[PDB]
Fold Amine oxidase [flavin-containing] B.
Amino acid sequence: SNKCDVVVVGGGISGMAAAKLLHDSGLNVVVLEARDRVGGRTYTLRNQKVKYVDLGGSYVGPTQNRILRLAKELGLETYKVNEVERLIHHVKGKSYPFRGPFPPVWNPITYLDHNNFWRTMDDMGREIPSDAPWKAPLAEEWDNMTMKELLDKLCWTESAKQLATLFVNLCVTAETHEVSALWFLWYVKQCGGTTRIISTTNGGQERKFVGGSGQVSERIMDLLGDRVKLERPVIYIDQTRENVLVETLNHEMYEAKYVISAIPPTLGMKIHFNPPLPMMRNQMITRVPLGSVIKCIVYYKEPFWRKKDYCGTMIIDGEEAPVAYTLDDTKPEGNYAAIMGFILAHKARKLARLTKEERLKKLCELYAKVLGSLEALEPVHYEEKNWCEEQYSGGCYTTYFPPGILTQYGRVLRQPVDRIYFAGTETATHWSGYMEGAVEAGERAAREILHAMGKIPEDEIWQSEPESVDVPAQPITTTFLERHLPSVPGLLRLI
Amino acid sequence: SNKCDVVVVGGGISGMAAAKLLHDSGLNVVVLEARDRVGGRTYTLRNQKVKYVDLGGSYVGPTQNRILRLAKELGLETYKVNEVERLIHHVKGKSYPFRGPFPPVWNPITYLDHNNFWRTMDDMGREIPSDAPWKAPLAEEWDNMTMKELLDKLCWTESAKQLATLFVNLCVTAETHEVSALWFLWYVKQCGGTTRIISTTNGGQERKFVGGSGQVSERIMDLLGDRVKLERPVIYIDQTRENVLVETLNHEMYEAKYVISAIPPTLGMKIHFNPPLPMMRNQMITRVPLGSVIKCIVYYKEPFWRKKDYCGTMIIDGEEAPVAYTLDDTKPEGNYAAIMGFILAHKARKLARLTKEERLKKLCELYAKVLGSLEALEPVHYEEKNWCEEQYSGGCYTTYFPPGILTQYGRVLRQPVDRIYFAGTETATHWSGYMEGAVEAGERAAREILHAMGKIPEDEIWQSEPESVDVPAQPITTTFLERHLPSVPGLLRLIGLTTI
Ligand SMILES: *Cc1cc2c(cc1C)nc1c(=O)[nH]c(=O)nc-1n2C[C@H](O)[C@H](O)[C@H](O)COP(=O)(O)OP(=O)(O)OC[C@H]1O[C@@H](n2cnc3c(N)ncnc32)[C@H](O)[C@@H]1O
Ligand SMILES: *Cc1cc2c(cc1C)nc1c(=O)[nH]c(=O)nc-1n2C[C@H](O)[C@H](O)[C@H](O)COP(=O)(O)OP(=O)(O)OC[C@H]1O[C@@H](n2cnc3c(N)ncnc32)[C@H](O)[C@@H]1O
Ligand SMILES: O=C(Nc1cccc(Cl)c1)c1coc2ccccc2c1=O
Ligand SMILES: O=C(Nc1cccc(Cl)c1)c1coc2ccccc2c1=O
């Protein structure tokens, strides 16, 4: 066998960040990656037509200080996603341009309902500990309800319910009826709340990496050299002996003191364990699916939308639209003009049956309608990736928790199993689901091992992160009226 | 590589039934079984204290003609579970003995609510095709709510809601908020409806096999000889070449024309596929967990409950009770007196923290109160099995579907993937979740392959089963009043219309 200090299973950002930390501390690490590439749910494609394009995870923003620091160390730079001009909300067949992060409404009743919806998401979040959502005071009540049930209760207008539904679909690539309310509320809260998670300027979608996010994993692979083994899917982990034994599908055996599992939780099912996993993890990893998304990028000769004072962001309500959300994917120089759109949740399943060319046509026709421009019908290039197809991801962006699961099994996610510690963005406590969470979790799991080895104290397992100088966070603010305007039923109680 | 016609992955009842059918048709079959035993979610323990005991699947009954026929052919016999004396419904700390399958109520409003609850489960079920539940007219609406939501809408009394909750917990070893309403309604309907699924006499729990259900898989192994390979967990299936290659964990390669996957759907995740699975199956197998149950058998010197005119059946509502349901597990000879109980759904997780001895004590204390009998505190022996611990089962009894999954992914459950065909009880259309469904699916999958090989016509893939002459099925009937008594809101509507 091939002997080392730590085997890291998975060469996504999380596994790479863990391996780098352990390597930098002087341990001999091996990364076993199932695919013929690193990066996992990040994947940057290069060709002459696009130069580069992120087909997986791409955006970073303020408060994501760990991914920003790691990337900066590896020599990467960011640029801002274009949000100079107006955003579009397309509702009942018409485009309504706006500025600011939240799509506005004019009807007084609908205004109260929208205001109350967003406010309530954050109010509920304040009672959910980031590191232990199952300790929320109403954890059981909220976990035993889907987001569809919660929205049906909260939203007195169809307007609010449709936007709230889009919000859920876009955040977690899942239907409102598929996901626990507790989990979804936790998910938003642990990204810093509604404003932070939905915002381009001053939020999660503010920036992209120049040259693609795949460079994070690639450049850590560059550092580690032949310590990264590609096309080594892990099939078997044996902890019965002195050293942990890790076997791959291509018949290699690795021997280590400890293991980091840096794969999506459910993909633990692809590994046969000796001894068997404890009951709760055994069942947990069958209860935690990933979402469904096709990421689609349509290229144009110019960013023609900008001429009409549109930035390229479209929020598109309703069943008919294949894509509910877009961002300008143009490169910082104004070249490789492009619109990125997501085909979300059930639509990813439905539209997957079409050809690439058929999806292109549907997207272009949608964009022509929403941007009010025939230029949208003249694409120069198209790239897409359906993440539902991936054996070694299970979906994207991340794992969702159906009703009842987080309270019953949530504690299990990062609980060590003998000498196996658990990384992966799903185990993070801040921006779980994102590249930021991947770094947090990888580095925390690495430091758990350093602590197990007696190399650092307990209090250094979790480490704060200085704020990025390049991408500082501005405060999230609310107005007096936003804080104090009644809900619809609140207004009815007064009458 | 070890060459054959068909590799069957999994040596449970379904895989063994498939392998037997293929073997009997003259093909060369291999069964690759992960464990050191066959039977899977069936497991018959033998020792001197119990003689034999089913720790997994046990009960068979009328309308389950495939398992009955298979078992009979293998030389097995059944006996009736004891239901001579009164059943007990224990509610709010008190026991109420009764007869008939449904726990009764006296309060007229509660009576209407209970009657409407069961009726409505079956009314909704009649809308749902057994072979295509996603084709129900309101499939999407029903699949997008949990059973909790449905019961909250349907049950106008807490009495009905509590019993309905126990019904779901006991039927599918999952919480009402965990499971799709469409899927649960399908599940009940495809067992023949509420009466059939809940009944001992004339239903699913009528009988057990003399000597244990494990004998079904064991006796098929005896017929197959060395074709069954134990401690061969399958890790890899490669369909890129002319013949399918199937690799095991212990470093063996098998080569076949076709493969039958006879494992729980989610346990397909334990196999690496080349080429990758199609998208819909890739995601489906991460969305279909199994339920949670500890099966617990407490042994006594005598079946003392019978002397108080209790048959041993206890239906126990609420949170505090560790066990919500019991049956008499005494041998047909009248010895090895025993009570079988299930610890269900979240309680299987909660009470797994305890020792075996602590669980025995809590069960005995519960039974002593429910039976009003100090003798329940004097057990002579105890056996149990927590199926949540099993790497190669994932849980018991079966796979449940959370909201939204059956409509989006249900159609690919038994869709072949090139030369892989899908057996397992989960793919059955009649008594899916049960030993019966395991037989149906194994035999159907086997015949799919026979058809692919040009050995039988397409109309022979699905085959009806003659009714058992030993376990005849009484029809499910309703009374006029059961059919036409109003629901609680129906009564309220009548009240508003009268006074107008
Ligand atoms: C897919 C996606 C993701 C995404 C998103 C849009 C799409 C379409 N947008 C994002 C965004 O704009 N900003 C952001 O910060 N995140 C976004 N996401 C999510 C993001 O990509 C993920 O959160 C992150 O990449 C997850 O990283 P992590 O390291 O936790 O996980 P991973 O990338 O899945 O890596 C796991 C690796 O393990 C390998 N693997 C799997 N099984 C095995 C076995 N058995 N043996 C060995 N290796 C295994 C995988 O191949 C993978 O490389
Ligand atoms: C567990 C349980 C089940 C049960 C029940 C009570 C409990 C506690 N009560 C039942 C009852 O009274 N009556 C009844 O008819 N059914 C009852 N159930 C359900 C019943 O046991 C199951 O429906 C049935 O046994 C399932 O049969 P099936 O053949 O479909 O599935 P299986 O038994 O799980 O067999 C699968 C086999 O495959 C092996 N395996 C798993 N993974 C692999 C890999 N990778 N490679 C090779 N083999 C694999 C398993 O080890 C198993 O043997
Ligand atoms: O909720 C979001 N944006 C948003 C932006 C405007 C309106 C509404 Cl309702 C939602 C976002 C949620 O998570 C994401 C994850 C990856 C990429 C983009 C987003 C996103 O824009
Ligand atoms: O629903 C059931 N029984 C029942 C019996 C009486 C009252 C009520 Cl509410 C329920 C049962 C359903 O599925 C089963 C599966 C394996 C073993 C027993 C049962 C069962 O008794």
Notes: The first strand of chain A starts at residue 2 and ends at 3. Residues 480 and 486 of chain A are 12 Å apart (CA to CA). The radius of gyration of chain A is 23 Å. Chain A has three domains: 1-40+62-77+210-288+402-462, 41-61+78-106+199-209+289-401, 107-198.
